[PDB]
Structures are given as structure tokens and as C-alpha cells.
Design a protein around this ligand. Structure first.
Ligand code: HEO
Ligand code: UQ8
Ligand code: 3PE
Ligand code: 3PE
Ligand code: 3PE
Ligand code: 3PE
Ligand code: 3PE
Ligand code: HEM
Ligand code: CU
Lengths: 259, 184, 97, 659
């Protein structure tokens, strides 16, 4: 009940919790009577019971087999009003109707860690992201290596990370705090250590202090030569800040596979 | 008796038709997968594929005359119509090898420009079935010449008759999608 | 007899191969009509090779040996068109928009 | 001697592997030493190994599946021990190099070499018996189809001892299983274990498709067939139409690793998403092969032990056909989170719920089959009651996962892991153990132990709800699959319950061994004399127990459904014919093992780049195929004296018990 999906902190996660609960309630009208008839008919109609009706030649009924076909169809039809209006509303790569200047965060998967680029701030971070609360966050996710999956379970949806491909994801945090984000797709021996933190600041004043802190680091990523040094195979990487990034570093990760 | 193996081989060719359709689906995604290499128009010489289409077409009418001679009682005519369609089958293999040898020497192999990987995985996979059918035809030619047109030999001709005509149906789909559409 | 059935399936297969080859080599002043005629004559030449060569018939194996081909055509049309439509949307997405 | 074998590939300095290497070798040498002590090497040959009899091949399919069930579980209990230890801060044994080879091997063994031979083995034993057929349509092909699976279980087993297995999961995803991210022989062991077993599995589907359609009894139409044969007919269609997709997709991965081609790479124009489209286009038709004869097994058992006709035969037959058609248009649900459009995810999301409708018709038809019957609480009946409770919970999970909006937070989590361990352990493993108990008197002539059969059931169903129901809660709190080291301490105390649940299932497999040990030891007391221990309905129970190796002196004439039940209702049900005729039977062939012996040499040579042995291995499979074409002595006639002696020693046991 308080396990990051039944207690979400994002608008996508809150609308996905209701989608799970409404689907679970619709399927229980035909699964719970299926379980109860599996035990109720087994107990009442035993071979040791003599008061029960015994009809060995009864194997066809039009008024019974119609109900066997109609009610799973009617559940699926009521689940066909859903799964179309919700798939077109909870889809990634669709901006949320909030209109409060969404912040774009560029995500590059590595072996075996997460590399985050802020193009509008010129700050690059490793295994840590920050964004103000109640603001839309634009995620552009790619991979420098084998397939991963960007996943913050308490904020909402996930999306795959592929080499040379730019997946898109929109998220928003309704409450301030820190949320543990992991990789959902297995990517090798260092897959168990690909865990990051998403720090949702209470306001944009506490977010700008984190950006100003991250540009005081002596490390820079102004060229692709320093990018490939950071792209060395390593496991359980700590939080690292880069003061200066390339203005178009995210395109260079895609263009090294597509060209 | 004999019709069980003929129908059972027809179901295998239906699985083989699904097997070839995966290569057609893989090729259609990787039509534009040229990583700076040659395209379809820079490679496909349509006079060279027109001879290859007629060689497989001549090998299907030739096997059709062998099945007519099987319905007769002429032992020597089945062998003579089987020797001609083996030459047309060998000429189809001998031109696909020459087409593949020209690409590998010139640097257009499967290891470069992975559109070429899907090209070698569809024409080459079709060429393996004709090569497999050529060994089956050569094995069948020595059993009819030794034992005759027995009951078990008549079933093996009809099983290969389904197999050899099926490879011409696939080659119709091969030269339409790959050569004709690629070299417009 | 059956000799004329193989010859009619052989003459028509020549006509259904030269004409698709002739339009591409000449040019025919229209790319859309070329793609229409290539795909139309490929299906007809397959159906010639099923009746005249493979001897497909509804009354062959008590209703079988024909419905197995119709079923596998639908499976291929599910697999080919379905995966092309999936991979087209996967390639229309995952681009630098 | 040549290739990449250099004696350092043997996993020395690793005590976990080296104990199990010596366990197989000393266990195998003890198994070989017992056969030569009793002098049973001449009995395994010419009666079991080269036999084209479908009952002999049906039993040996299960024995391979039972033995691989021991290996596929004993490495799965190491993962429950590792994940319990890795929580609460303790990096114990199983390093990530060692750990990633396990669930790849756990997935491959349990899908292809446990569940597939058990489903095929139940179809190999019962389906020719139910249609009045004396044998399968292609008897030599059925023997060769068995030995290709033995090549599959050999290459996985020698990967533990000679090299290593893959580290990419059970489906060998793109570039992590490529030649630049997996340069070892691990993916090569994965490729040739599935290629050589997959070409033998495809020949099984062709063999049973012609057997049901053409080798039926005279008078039996398609709608007078047994329900298990209808389920086996629709399951073999999925084998024919999906295993060629598996054959191409693994071979396309073979060209990338060997020839250096570009199909699923990221650099030279290859598309890595094309493999996941193709490996799941077979993948969901693969799993409906597992669940369809299970529905046929449970339909026969629920009709037998309720003393009542099967409710809704026409509804159950057409539900099985609708599953077969809809299985090929749902494969996009396994990779909803790839990044497809809204129109693509919602279209395949809707039709994934459509295939749940014919599954729900089958569930409610067995409920009304037991609506007004006399239910006998047999051990095999307990699996049927336990199936409906267990499959409905995990089936409800799958339709919840069919929604792409719900799938965005539950993809590749333990909620997914608990979903398909709910419908395979609940569905297939309960289904295969139900048919193992139900057809044990027909396969061997004696009944299983009833006391240990019920005890083995209660450890399996209660032990499942402790092993995998915490994984439903663990998938909600964000724990993903294939997590090896440094798990979050909030995931502790829920993984400990899941690790404790695997101990109870370990007792259920242990109770299965005790059940087989007591029944073999006490086979002279509970002996099936009449060939029909329960109230049989299908034509398999009309034969003797065991069948007389031709299974029918005279092929029966079928007039209605449940022909053996209608024969007993008519009154006679046991009529000695006035005369017998010679029976055309195939001979046992030494080929099929020799073709399999040259394929496991060819398979081993391709993995270690021994190219000279690969040519000899590949030519060995072709020359043996060519030399098994000049053999004119492939059939023989059973004399009427052998038939009349076996029928006369069966009809007197019928006359002893009243009839
Ligand atoms: C044989 C095994 C098996 C079975 C029986 C099923 C049955 C289903 N499969 Fe489960 N699938 C199976 C094999 C798998 N599927 C998987 C994963 C999986 C996922 C991915 C989820 C995710 O990745 O997060 C989806 C969407 C489905 C869809 C379904 C659906 C809708 C059913 C339905 O058919 C269930 C139908 C049964 C029902 C519905 C209950 C019976 C009906 C009753 C009692 C009354 C009627 C009620 C209704 C119709 C609502 N499969 C995976 C994991 C793959 C991996 O390793 O990555 C495997 C192995
Ligand atoms: C690398 O990851 C690991 C595995 O995955 C590959 C393991 O299976 C395992 C082994 C797991 C277990 C404890 C199961 C132990 C094995 C059991 C119960 C015996 C089952 C095996 C057999 C009887 C099969 C018979 C053998 C053959 C057909 C092939 C034998 C061939 C040779 C080498 C001669 C480990 C330890 C492991 O670390
Ligand atoms: C390169 C890698 C792949 C290699 C594949 C193997 C090809 C090598 C050559 C094999 C063919 C040699 C056949 C020799 C003749 C022996 C069989 C025969 O006489 O055919 C008759 C047989 C009917 O059976 P019956 O009449 O009872 O006699 C039993 C024979 N054992 O009729 C039959 O049903 C048997 C004949 C079956 C025809 C074989 C089908 C060919 C398929 C080859 C696919 C090749 C490419 C694979 C692609 C994988 C994915 C990329
Ligand atoms: C290096 C490995 C390479 C790969 C190996 C893979 C092998 C797969 C195939 C193994 C299975 C072979 C058959 C198993 C033995 C079955 C014996 C049996 O059922 O009893 C036979 C007989 C009883 O009388 P009968 O009436 O004939 O029995 C039933 C008739 N329907 O009883 C008798 O009279 C004889 C007494 C018993 C016979 C002794 C046989 C011992 C069992 C052999 C090993 C079994 C386990 C192998 C595991 C392999 C796992 C991969
Ligand atoms: C599954 C196909 C996948 C495609 C790739 C591999 C292709 C090779 C397999 C193709 C052969 C399939 C033929 C199926 C025909 C079935 C119907 C039929 O006509 O069967 C007749 C016969 C069975 O004979 P039966 O009636 O049982 O008794 C008579 C014994 N003389 O049947 C036979 O005797 C012939 C069939 C048995 C012999 C086949 C074994 C050879 C397999 C070699 C594999 C080569 C490639 C290996 C590498 C993996 C791929 C790269
Ligand atoms: C749905 C179909 C049914 C399911 C398929 C079967 C799956 C499990 C396979 C195990 C059982 C198969 C063999 C059963 C044979 C029963 C014994 C028998 O018939 O007698 C043979 C022998 C004594 O023979 P005798 O008594 O002289 O002859 C009379 C025969 N009634 O009796 C003996 O003393 C020898 C018995 C040999 C037992 C063979 C066991 C080898 C295979 C075991 C597989 C793995 C078992 C799990 C691990 C066990 C570990 C210890
Ligand atoms: C399947 C049927 C065919 C099987 C038989 C193939 C035998 C090939 C022998 C080739 C011998 C040779 O000279 O190979 C050269 C080359 C590697 O050269 P080498 O100097 O041995 O380098 C060592 C490690 N690569 O070798 C290579 O580059 C690899 C050659 C083998 C190609 C793999 C076959 C792909 C089959 C996929 C399904 C069809
Ligand atoms: C008592 C029985 C079993 C137990 C305790 C068990 C346990 C497990 C565990 C711990 C995992 C890995 C979960 C993770 O990676 O987080 C797994 C995965 C898996 N299991 Fe089982 N399992 C059992 C039986 C079976 C059976 C009968 C099958 C039959 C097909 C099966 C098929 C699979 C597959 C395919 C995977 C996925 C492997 C992968 O993703 O690489 N398991 N199981
Ligand atoms: Cu599926």
C-alpha cells in the first residue's frame, strides 16, 4: 500500500495506479467466481455425497453456454473502452498539459552507469539527476552500449535505451524528495549497480543551487576524447559532476552509431 | 501409404514458406540499411538476373516432363529428363556463386553495409535449398537407375516434385522484391 | 492430357517474367505503374505455378492440402505486414525530432 | 585438439562448478556401470534406443524432461539463496560472471528441455492411442525427433564442464549477445543447443499433424475426436508455424557472430529491434504450445473422475482453434516499452485481451463438467482442482499486464517473473504431473502410489504460494529481474519468504521420487489387469496395460464421442474376433542415433571453431541420411500367432474380473 506503485509521487504514476486498480476490479468479477466454483462444486458434488444431483448425460445447455461466452466478452468490451483512451494518454513522447517551461534532461546509458546531460544549463552529472517539483521533465534517452531501460518506479513510466536511437519520456514529480531510479533491462555484470537518485527539489531556488554546485567541479566534458575516457567499462560508479559539457554532445552519441 | 509422405512433405514446405517469409521481412526492414555502401541500383544487373530466372523456369518444365514419364512405364525417359533439369539447376547455382564472388572480391560482402547482409541471407538461403535439391536429385537419379520405378521411388519423385517447383515459387518472390524493386 | 497443362503454365510464366523485366529496363515513364504491374504479375505467376505445376486442388486430400496453404498465406501476411508496420513506427520514432 | 580449446576453458579454481562437474561424471559412470553389471546394454539397444514405437519414445521424452527438471531446479534454488544473501548487505557466493550464466541456463533448460519434452512426451504416448492408430504416421522421423532433443541436452550440459553458457538471458538479446560484447563461447552454446533441438522439434509438429488428420480410426470424424487430440492438433499447428521463425532468428545471430554480418548491430546499418520483433513472433506461439495439450489433459481427467460427460464439446473445440489463430497477432506485448506509437501499443494491447476470452470458456466448461457429477478425489484430480485456482490468478495477472499503461511500470520486474511462474508451474507443470499420474497404468501396467501422490501435490501448490506470491509484491515496490548483487534492504524479508517457498517445492520434487520408488517396489500389488483402472472414456483404455506393441489387433469402428464409454454402455465392450490378420509394422533403425551423434559433434565443433571437425560432423549427418535411403528392409509383418497369443493372455484377465 506504500510500495512506490500503490503510493506514487508523479502524475503518470498516479494515473497508472488507477489504471491497475480499475483493471484489477474488472477482472475480479469473473476470476473470483471461477475460484469459488472450483472449490464449491468440488465440495458439494463429491462421490461421498448422496443428496447431490447426479446427471452424467447432461453436457449441453444453450442457456448456460451463452453466459460462458457473453460475460468474458462484456468484460473485455468494457476493457476496450479502456486500454485505448489510456494508452493514448499515458504514452511517452507526449508532453503534459502543464505549460511551466519543461526542462530537458539528456540521458546516455553506459557500462555500467547513467550519464546525464543538461543542455540548457551546461552541466553533466553521473548517476544523479535533479529537477524542480511540479514541473514537467523531458527525458531524451539513448545508449552508448547495449540495451538498458530508464526507470524511476515512483515517478511513472519507463522507456528503453538503445544505441543510435533517441527514445523520449515525459515525467513530473508532484512531491519533493529523493526517488531511487534503476535500470530495468539487463545489460551485463554491472547491471546490479546501475542505480541513480532523482532529487526533486521543493522549488527552483534549491534547484539552481544544485546546478551552481555542479559547475564548481574541475572535471570537464568539452570533447569526445574525455567522453570515451568516461565511457570505460566500470561498475558501481559514484556521483560525479562535470562543469563544462559539449553544446551538442547528445547528437555525437547518436551519430557515432548512425554514421 | 504413398500419399501420406506426399502430404506430410507438403506441410513441411508450408513451414519452409514461413521460413522464407522471415528473410523477406528481415530484408524489407534493411532495404535502406546501407552504411555508405552501394545501393540496389549500383549492384543489380538485370540482364544477369533474367538468365537466372529462365534457368529455374526451364528446370520446372523439365521436371514436369519427368513426372509425366513417371506416369508412363519408360525407365530411361525419367533419367533423361532428370539429367536435363540437373544442368539447369547447376547453372542457377553457378551464376549465384559468380554473382556472390564478384561482390566479395570488390568489397561488397556481408560484413560491410548490412543491407548486403540481408541480401546474402535471402539469395544465399534460397541457393542453399537449390543446392540441397541438387544433391537430392543426384541421389534419386542413382536409385531409379539401379532399382527402377518402384513404389518407393515414385513417392520420392513426387516429394521432390513438390520441393523443386516450390523453389521456383520462392524465386518469383525473390526477384520481385529484391531485384525488380531494388533496381528501379 | 497433362502435357498441355505444363506447357500452358510454361508459356504464361515467360510472359509474366519478360514484361516485369521490360518495364524496369525501359523506364515506362511512371514509377507508380511499374510497382503496380510488378506486384500484380508476381501474384498471378505464383498462382500459375500452383495450379499448373504443383497441381493444387480442393478435392486432393479430403479438403486438405489447400486449406493448409490458405492458412499459411494468412500467417505469412500476419508476419510480414505486421512486422513491417511495427518496425516502421519504431523507425519513425527514435529519431532526433 | 584444435580451435579455441586450450585446456584453460575448463572452469578450474571454482569449487561450485567443479563439484557439479564431478557429480555428473561420477553419477554418469555409476549409471553406465549398473547397465553393464546387469547386461542390459543389449536390451537398451533394439528395444528402447532404436525403437520407433511411440510409447517407448513417449516415455523417454519424459525421462529426459524429469532429469532436466532436477538440474533446472537445483540452479534455480541457488538464485533464491543468492538473492536472500545479497540482501541486507552480504556479498556472498555467486559472482555476477557466475550468476548470469544461471538464469540463462535456467530459462533454456526449463523451456526447451523440461516443458517441451514433457508436453511432446504426453502427446507421443496418448494421441496415437486415442485415434485408433497402431503407430505414428512417420515412425523413423519420430525416433529422430527424440534424439535431436538429446543433442540439445548434451550441449547445455557440456557448457558447464568444457566452456561456459551465455550471459544474456534465455532469448539472447542484441548486442550484449553480439561478437563485440560477448566474445566468449557462451552464446555459441546457446545458438547450437536451440538450432539442433529446434529442427527436431519442427519434425515433431509435422509428424503429429499428419497422424491426427490421416491415421484416425474408420468412422471417427473430426468432431468425434477426443478433446486431448483436438488440443494436440491445434498445438502442433503452432509448432509448424513458429519454429521456422526460431530457426531463422538464431541463424541470423549465427551470421553476426561467425561471418561478422550486420543484422542486429548498431554500427553498419543493422537494426537491433528486428531481432526482438522476430524472437517474440515465435515467443508467444512457443508458450501456447506449452498450454494447449495441458487443456487437453485436464479436459480428459475432469471428465474421467467426475463420472460425467465433458460439458460443451463444441465450445471447447472452437476455443482451441481461436487460441491458435490469435496467438500470432499478439507478440508485440512483450516489448511494449520499446518506444512504439500509441496506435501500435493499443492495437496489440486490445487483441492480447481477446485471446483471454477462449481461455475463459475452457475454464468455465470444466467447472460445469463437475457441476452434477460424482467427483472422486484422486491424486490426478487434485491437480485439476489446483489448476483452476492457480491458473486463474496468474491468468488475471497477464491481462493486467496486457494493458500498455500498466505495462510501463511492471515491465521486466518480479511482477512479470511471478506472472509466468504462475501459469507454467500452475499450468504446465501441474498439467504434466496430472497426465503423468493419469497415464501411468497405461504406460507401465501398474498404478502409482496414491498416498505420496497427494503429498507431492500439497507441497507443490502451497509451496508455490510462498515462493512466488512475494514476487508479486516485490514487482510493485520496484525490484527488477536478474538482480545479482547489492540488493536494496527494503527488498529483504520479502525475498526471504520467497527463498523459503522454494524449499517446500524442493520437498514436492522429493516426494515425486518417493512416489516413483514405492510404486516400482510395490508394482505387484497395485497391478492394472483389465487395462482400465478408472472409468475410461477414450479408446486408449480399450487396450491392455501395457499396450501389446501394435496397440490394436483389429482397429475399432467409432460411432460416437467417447467410443470406449459407448462400448461399455452398449453392453459388450470386449469382443474376441473370429480371425486375425498380419499387422504391418516398421522396424527398429540404428539410424537417427548416428545422425544425432554426428550432429553433436558438428554442434560442438562450431562452438570451438574446430572447422575440420565441423566438415566431418556436417557430412556425417548427410551421408547417414543418404545411406538411410537404399535400405529396403524398413517394414515387416507381425505373424498372426504372435497377435493371437497376446490377445488370448489379455481376454482371460477380462474374464477373471466379471467381464
Ligand atoms: C505458457 C505460459 C504462458 C501463459 C499461459 C501466458 C498467458 C498470457 N500471457 Fe504471459 N503467457 C505465457 C508465457 C509468458 N507470457 C509472458 C509475459 C507476458 C506479458 C509481458 C508482461 C511484462 O513484460 O510486463 C504479457 C502482456 C503476456 C500476455 C499474456 C496474456 C494476456 C495471457 C492470458 O492468456 C491469460 C489467460 C488466462 C486467463 C485470463 C484466466 C482464465 C480465465 C478465467 C478464469 C475467466 C475469464 C476471465 C477473463 C477473460 C478476464 N505474457 C512471459 C515472460 C517472458 C519473459 O521471460 O520475458 C512468458 C514465459
Ligand atoms: C554456471 O552456472 C551453473 C549452472 O548453469 C550452467 C549449473 O547448471 C550448475 C549446476 C547446478 C545443479 C546443482 C544441478 C546439478 C546436476 C544434476 C542434478 C544432474 C543432472 C544432469 C545429468 C544426469 C544429465 C546427464 C548428462 C549428459 C546428457 C551430458 C554429459 C556429458 C559429458 C561431459 C560426458 C551450476 C553449479 C552453475 O554454477
Ligand atoms: C547449409 C546449412 C543447412 C543444411 C541443410 C541440409 C542440406 C544438405 C543436403 C540434404 C539433402 C540430401 C537428401 C538426400 C536424399 C535422401 C532423402 C530422400 O531420398 O528423400 C526422400 C524422402 C522421403 O522419405 P522416404 O521416401 O521414406 O525415404 C527416407 C529417407 N531418409 O524425402 C524427404 O522428405 C527427405 C528430403 C528432404 C529435403 C530436405 C530439405 C532441404 C532443406 C534445406 C535447407 C537449407 C538451408 C537452411 C536454412 C536455415 C536458416 C538460415
Ligand atoms: C552420456 C549420456 C548421453 C545421452 C543419454 C540420454 C539417454 C536418454 C534415453 C534414456 C532412457 C532409456 C530407457 C529407460 C529405461 C526404461 C526401462 C523400463 O521401462 O523398463 C523396461 C523393463 C520393464 O519391462 P517392460 O515390460 O519392457 O517395461 C515397459 C514396457 N512398455 O525392465 C527390464 O526388464 C530391464 C530393467 C531396466 C532397464 C535398465 C535401464 C536403466 C535406465 C537407463 C538410464 C535412465 C536415465 C537416463 C537419463 C538420461 C538423461 C539425459
Ligand atoms: C526442420 C527443418 C528445418 C530447416 C533447416 C534444416 C533442414 C533439414 C531438415 C529437412 C528435412 C525435413 C523433411 C520432412 C519430411 C517429412 C515427411 C516425409 O516425407 O517424411 C518421410 C521420412 C520419414 O520416414 P518414415 O516414414 O518415418 O520411415 C521411413 C524411413 N526410410 O522422412 C525422412 O526420412 C526425412 C526426414 C528425416 C531426415 C532429416 C534429418 C536431417 C537434418 C539435417 C540438418 C542439417 C542442418 C543442421 C544445422 C542447423 C541449421 C544451420
Ligand atoms: C505418462 C507416462 C509415464 C511417465 C513416464 C516415466 C517417467 C519416469 C520414469 C521412471 C520409471 C520408468 C521405469 C519404470 C519401470 C518399472 C519397473 C519394471 O517394470 O520392472 C523392471 C525391473 C524389474 O523387472 P522384472 O520385475 O523382472 O520384470 C517385470 C516388469 N513389470 O525393475 C527394476 O527393479 C528396475 C527399475 C528401473 C527403473 C528405471 C529408472 C531409470 C529412469 C529414472 C528417471 C529419473 C528418476 C528420478 C531420479 C531418481 C534418482 C534415484
Ligand atoms: C552450417 C553448414 C556449414 C558448416 C560448415 C562450415 C565450415 C567452414 C570452414 C571454413 C574454414 C576456414 O578457413 O574458415 C575461415 C574463417 C576463420 O578463419 P580462421 O583462420 O580459422 O580463424 C579462426 C576463428 N575465426 O572461418 C569463418 O570465418 C567462419 C566460417 C564458418 C561460417 C559459419 C557458418 C554459418 C552457418 C549459419 C547458419 C546457416
Ligand atoms: C520451483 C520452481 C522454480 C523456481 C524457484 C524458479 C525460480 C526462478 C528465478 C529465481 C528466476 C529469475 C528471476 C529473476 O531473474 O529475477 C527464474 C526465471 C525464469 N524461469 Fe524459473 N523457476 C522455477 C521453475 C521454472 C519452470 C518450471 C519454468 C518452465 C518454463 C521456468 C522458466 C523460467 C524462465 C524462462 C525464466 C527467465 C530466465 C531469464 O529471464 O533469463 N522456471 N525462475
Ligand atoms: Cu506472449
Amino acid at each position: 500500500c506504500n510500495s512506490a506503485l500503490l503510493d506514487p509521487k508523479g502524475q503518470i504514476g498516479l494515473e497508472q495506479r488507477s489504471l491497475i486498480l480499475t483493471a484489477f476490479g474488472l477482472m475480479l468479477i469473473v476470476v473470483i467466481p471461477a475460484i469459488l466454483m472450483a472449490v464449491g462444486f468440488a465440495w458439494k458434488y463429491r462421490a461421498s455425497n448422496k443428496d447431490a444431483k447426479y446427471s452424467p448425460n447432461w453436457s449441453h445447455s444453450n442457456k448456460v453456454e451463452a453466459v460462458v461466452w457473453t460475460v468474458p466478452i462484456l468484460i473485455i468490451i468494457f476493457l476496450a473502452v479502456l486500454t485505448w483512451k489510456t494508452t493514448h494518454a499515458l504514452e511517452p513522447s507526449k508532453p503534459l498539459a502543464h505549460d511551466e517551461k519543461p526542462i530537458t534532461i539528456e540521458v546516455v546509458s553506459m557500462d555500467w552507469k547513467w550519464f546525464f546531460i543538461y543542455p540548457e544549463q551546461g552541466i553533466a552529472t553521473v548517476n544523479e539527476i535533479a529537477f524542480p517539483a511540479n514541473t514537467p521533465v523531458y527525458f531524451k534517452v539513448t545508449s552508448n552500449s547495449v540495451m538498458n531501460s530508464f526507470f524511476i518506479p515512483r515517478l511513472g513510466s519507463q522507456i528503453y535505451a538503445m544505441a543510435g536511437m533517441q527514445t523520449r519520456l515525459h515525467l513530473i514529480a508532484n512531491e519533493p524528495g529523493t526517488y531511487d531510479g534503476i535500470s530495468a533491462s539487463y545489460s551485463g555484470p554491472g547491471f546490479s549497480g546501475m542505480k541513480f537518485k532523482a532529487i526533486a527539489t521543493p522549488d527552483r531556488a534549491a534547484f539552481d543551487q544544485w546546478v551552481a554546485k555542479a559547475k564548481q567541479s574541475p572535471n570537464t566534458m568539452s570533447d569526445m576524447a574525455a567522453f570515451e575516457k568516461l565511457a570505460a567499462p566500470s561498475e558501481y560508479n559514484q556521483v560525479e559532476y562535470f562543469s563544462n559539457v559539449k553544446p551538442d554532445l547528445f547528437a555525437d552519441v547518436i551519430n557515432k552509431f548512425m554514421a | 501409404a504413398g500419399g501420406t509422405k506426399i502430404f506430410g512433405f507438403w506441410i513441411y514446405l508450408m513451414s519452409d514458406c514461413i521460413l522464407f517469409s522471415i528473410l523477406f521481412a528481415t530484408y524489407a526492414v534493411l532495404v535502406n540499411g546501407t552504411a555508405g555502401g552501394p545501393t540496389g541500383k549500383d549492384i543489380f544487373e538485370l540482364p544477369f538476373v533474367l538468365v537466372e530466372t529462365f534457368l529455374l523456369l526451364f528446370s520446372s518444365i523439365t521436371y514436369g516432363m519427368a513426372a509425366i514419364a513417371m506416369y508412363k512405364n519408360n525407365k530411361s525417359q525419367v533419367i533423361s529428363w532428370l539429367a536435363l533439369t540437373w544442368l539447369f539447376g547447376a547453372g542457377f547455382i553457378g551464376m549465384e556463386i559468380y554473382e556472390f564472388h564478384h561482390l566479395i572480391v570488390n568489397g561488397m560482402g556481408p560484413d560491410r553495409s548490412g543491407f548486403l547482409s540481408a541480401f546474402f541471407a535471402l539469395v544465399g538461403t534460397h541457393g542453399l535449398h537449390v543446392t540441397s535439391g541438387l544433391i537430392w536429385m543426384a541421389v534419386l537419379m542413382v536409385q531409379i537407375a539401379r532399382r527402377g520405378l518402384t513404389s518407393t521411388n515414385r513417392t520420392r519423385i513426387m516429394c521432390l516434385s513438390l520441393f523443386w517447383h516450390f523453389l521456383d515459387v520462392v524465386w518469383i518472390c525473390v526477384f520481385t522484391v529484391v531485384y525488380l524493386m531494388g533496381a528501379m | 492430357g497433362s502435357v498441355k497443362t505444363y506447357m500452358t503454365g510454361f508459356i504464361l510464366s515467360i510472359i509474366l517474367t519478360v514484361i516485369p523485366f521490360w518495364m524496369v529496363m525501359t523506364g515506362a515513364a511512371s514509377p507508380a505503374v511499374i510497382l503496380g504491374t510488378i506486384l500484380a504479375m508476381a501474384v498471378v505467376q505464383v498462382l500459375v505455378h500452383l495450379v499448373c505445376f504443383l497441381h493444387m486442388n480442393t478435392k486432393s486430400d479430403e479438403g486438405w492440402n489447400m486449406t493448409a496453404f490458405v492458412f499459411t498465406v494468412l500467417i505469412i501476411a500476419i508476419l510480414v505486414v505486421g512486422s513491417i508496420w511495427i518496425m516502421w513506427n519504431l523507425n519513425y520514432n527514435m529519431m532526433m525530432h | 585438439m584444435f580451435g579455441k580449446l586450450s585446456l584453460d576453458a575448463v572452469p578450474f579454481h571454482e569449487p561450485i562448478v567443479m563439484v557439479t562437474i564431478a557429480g555428473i561424471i561420477l553419477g554418469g559412470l555409476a549409471l553406465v556401470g549398473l547397465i553393464t553389471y546387469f547386461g542390459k546394454w543389449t536390451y537398451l539397444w533394439k528395444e528402447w534406443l532404436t525403437s520407433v514405437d511411440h510409447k517407448r519414445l513417449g516415455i523417454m521424452y519424459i525421462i529426459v524432461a524429469i532429469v532436466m527438471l532436477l538440474r533446472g531446479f537445483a540452479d534455480a534454488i541457488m538464485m533464491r539463496s543468492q538473492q536472500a544473501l545479497a540482501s541486507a548487505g552480504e556479498a556472498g557466493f555467486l559472482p555476477p560472471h557466475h550468476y548470469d550464466q544461471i538464469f540463462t541456463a535456467h530459462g533454456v533448460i526449463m523451456i526447451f528441455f523440461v516443458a517441451m519434452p514433457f508436453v511432446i512426451g504426453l502427446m507421443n504416448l496418448v494421441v496415437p492411442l486415442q485415434i485408433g492408430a497402431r503407430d505414428v504416421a512417420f515412425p523413423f522421423l519420430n525416433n529422430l525427433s527424440f534424439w535431436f532433443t538429446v543433442v540439445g541436452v548434451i550441449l547445455v550440459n557440456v557448457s558447464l564442464g568444457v566452456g561456459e553458457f551465455a550471459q544474456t538471458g534465455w532469448l539472447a538479446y542484441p548486442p550484449l549477445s553480439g561478437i563485440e560484447y560477448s566474445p566468449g563461447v557462451g552464446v555459441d552454446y546457446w545458438i547450437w543447443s536451440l538450432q539442433l533441438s529446434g529442427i527436431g522439434t519442427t519434425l515433431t509438429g509435422i509428424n503429429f499433424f499428419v497422424t491426427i488428420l490421416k491415421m484416425r480410426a474408420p468412422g471417427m470424424t473430426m468432431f468425434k475426436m477426443p478433446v486431448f487430440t483436438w488440443a494436440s492438433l491445434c498445438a502442433n499447428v503452432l509448432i509448424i508455424a513458429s519454429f521456422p521463425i526460431l530457426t531463422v532468428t538464431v541463424a541470423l545471430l549465427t551470421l553476426d557472430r561467425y561471418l561478422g554480418t550486420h543484422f542486429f548491430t548498431n554500427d553498419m546499418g543493422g537494426n537491433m529491434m528486428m531481432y526482438i520483433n522476430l524472437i517474440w513472433a515465435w515467443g508467444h506461439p512457443e508458450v501456447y504450445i506449452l498450454i494447449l495439450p495441458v487443456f487437453g489433459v485436464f479436459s480428459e481427467i475432469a471428465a474421467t473422475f467426475s463420472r460425467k460427460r465433458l460439458f460443451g464439446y463444441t465450445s471447447l473445440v472452437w476455443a482451441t482453434v481461436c487460441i491458435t489463430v490469435l496467438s500470432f497477432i499478439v507478440w508485440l506485448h512483450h516489448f511494449f516499452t520499446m518506444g512504439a506509437g500509441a496506435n501500435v501499443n493499443a492495437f496489440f494491447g486490445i487483441t492480447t485481451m481477446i485471446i483471454a476470452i477462449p481461455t475463459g470458456v475452457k475454464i468455465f466448461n470444466w467447472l460445469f463438467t463437475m457441476y452434477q457429477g460424482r467427483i472422486v478425489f484422486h491424486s490426478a484430480m487434485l491437480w485439476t482442482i489446483g489448476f483452476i485456482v492457480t491458473f486463474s490468478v496468474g491468468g488475471m495477472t497477464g491481462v493486467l499486464l496486457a494493458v500498455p499503461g500498466a505495462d510501463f511500470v511492471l515491465h521486466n520486474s518480479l511482477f512479470l517473473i511471478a506472472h509466468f511462474h504462475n501459469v507454467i508451474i500452475g499450468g504446465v507443470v501441474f498439467g504434466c504431473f496430472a497426465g503423468m499420474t493419469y497415464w501411468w497404468p497405461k504406460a507401465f501396467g501398474f498404478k502409482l502410489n496414491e498416498t505420496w501422490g497427494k503429498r507431492a501435490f500439497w507441497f507443490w501448490i502451497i509451496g508455490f504460494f510462498v515462493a512466488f506470491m512475494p514476487l508479486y509484491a516485490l514487482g510493485f515496490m520496484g525490484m527488477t529481474r536478474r538482480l545479482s548483487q547489492q540488493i536494496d534492504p527494503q527488498f529483504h524479508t520479502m525475498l526471504m519468504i520467497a527463498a523459503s517457498g522454494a524449499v517446500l517445492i524442493a520437498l514436492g520434487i522429493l516426494c515425486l521420487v518417493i512416489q516413483m520408488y514405492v510404486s516400482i517396489r510395490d508394482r505387484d500389488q497395485n497391478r492394472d489387469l483389465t487395462g482400465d483402472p478408472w472409468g475410461g472414456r477414450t479408446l486408449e483404455w480399450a487396450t491392455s496395460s501395457p499396450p501389446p506393441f501394435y496397440n490394436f489387433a483389429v482397429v475399432p469402428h467409432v460411432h460416437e464421442r467417447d467410443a470406449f464409454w459407448e462400448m461399455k454402455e452398449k453392453g459388450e465392450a470386449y469382443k474376441k474376433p473370429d480371425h486375425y490378420e498380419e499387422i504391418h509394422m516398421p522396424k527398429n533403425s540404428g539410424a537417427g542415433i548416428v545422425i544425432a551423434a554426428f550432429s553433436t559433434i558438428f554442434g560442438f565443433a562450431m562452438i570451438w571453431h574446430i572447422w575440420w571437425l565441423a566438415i566431418v560432423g556436417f557430412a556425417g549427418m548427410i551421408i547417414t541420411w543418404i545411406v538411410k535411403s537404399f535400405d529396403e528392409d524398413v517394414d515387416y509383418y507381425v505373424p498372426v500367432a504372435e497377435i493371437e497369443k497376446l490377445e488370448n493372455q489379455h481376454f482371460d484377465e477380462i474374464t477373471k474380473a466379471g467381464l
